[PDB]
Design a protein around this ligand. Structure first.
Ligand SMILES: *CCCCCCOCCOCCNC(=O)CN(C)S(=O)(=O)c1ccc(NC)c2nonc12
Ligand SMILES: [Cl-]
Length: 290
């Protein structure tokens, strides 16, 4: 599994702020938009893009306040990421797209797809945001931690001051051992604790036990849309998983229209780090069928 990031920087102005994105592959077709989540960047797609790039354009932006994008003084609520990602897509003049989404990127992708259904020709997704009705439906071993993350006192000491989402939560979301080189790439954007606001607000935005109300309703809405949509779907899952257990993955493969499920083997949250070659090859294969 490659540790390098051999991609030239591309930048575009979005609502007054510069956002960074990877941009490779030919301009003569339908682009593929890769959306990462918390606490990652376009780096998380480094070993998946080379499988798709030869046949399709690959665009992988860093969310505002993350990766190599600018760091404006914001609360970094989901609404902020929505405004910026909406404007990013328009700034690149993209008409029709295929989405490849993960974690909070999936919340952005599905929410955008719901509002622009005619512009989405396919969605590949993995370990995605869905409504968690109660704390019982959150992984048992991470309940205390994420309950602690969702506080203004303990949560901010952990995530902001001590950087545990990078130093702990990130590597614990990968089955195989993340190397020090890979950890350093993920560390780069958040060396200053003042820049870690996005890392704390994200887990506080998760739709768990009806809070926050707005995110729960927003996510419920795009899941209803996904169940009602005939758009091609590609669901990657692993065992034991984190947000999407093997049992739920199989249920979704049946209930969602036009959905193909692919088992990646052992995995937790960052499935891209456990089996990038299968994920990449299956996206390339799937794209040719569309
Ligand atoms: C996509 C958004 C959701 C991401 C889900 C990520 O789940 C991955 C698994 O979660 C691991 C939860 N545990 C931890 O983050 C850290 N543990 C609580 S820890 O290892 O016991 C721990 C405890 C305390 C401290 N510092 C005071 C730690 N620093 O690093 N790990 C620590
Ligand atoms: Cl999160």
């Amino acid at each position: 599994i490659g540790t390098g990031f051999p991609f030239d920087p591309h930048y575009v102005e979005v609502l007054g702020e510069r956002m960074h994105y990877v941009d490779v592959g030919p301009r003569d077709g339908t682009p593929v938009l890769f959306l990462h989540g918390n606490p990652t960047s376009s780096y998380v797609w480094r070993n998946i893009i080379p499988h798709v790039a030869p046949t399709h354009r690959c665009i992988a932006p860093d969310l505002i306040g993350m990766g190599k994008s600018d760091k404006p003084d914001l609360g970094y609520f989901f609404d902020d990421h929505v405004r910026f990602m909406d404007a990013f897509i328009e700034a690149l003049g993209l008409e029709e797209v295929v989405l490849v989404i993960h974690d909070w990127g999936s919340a952005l992708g599905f929410h955008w797809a719901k509002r622009n259904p005619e512009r989405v020709k396919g969605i590949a997704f993995m370990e995605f945001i869905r409504p968690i009705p109660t704390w019982d439906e959150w992984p048992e071993f991470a309940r205390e931690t994420f309950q602690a993350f969702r506080t203004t006192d303990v949560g901010r000491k952990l995530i902001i001051d001590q950087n545990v989402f990078i130093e702990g939560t990130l590597p614990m979301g990968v089955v195989r051992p993340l190397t020090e080189v890979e950890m350093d790439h993920y560390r780069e954007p958040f060396l200053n604790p003042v820049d870690r606001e996005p890392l704390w607000r994200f887990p506080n935005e998760l739709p768990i036990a009806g809070e926050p109300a707005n995110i729960v309703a927003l996510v419920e809405e795009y899941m209803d849309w996904l169940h009602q949509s005939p758009v091609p779907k590609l669901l990657f899952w692993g065992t034991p998983g984190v947000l999407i257990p093997p049992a739920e993955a199989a249920r979704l493969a049946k209930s969602l229209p036009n959905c193909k499920a692919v088992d990646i083997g052992p995995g937790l949250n960052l499935l891209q780090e456990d089996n990038p070659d299968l994920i990449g090859s299956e996206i390339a294969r799937w794209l040719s069928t569309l």
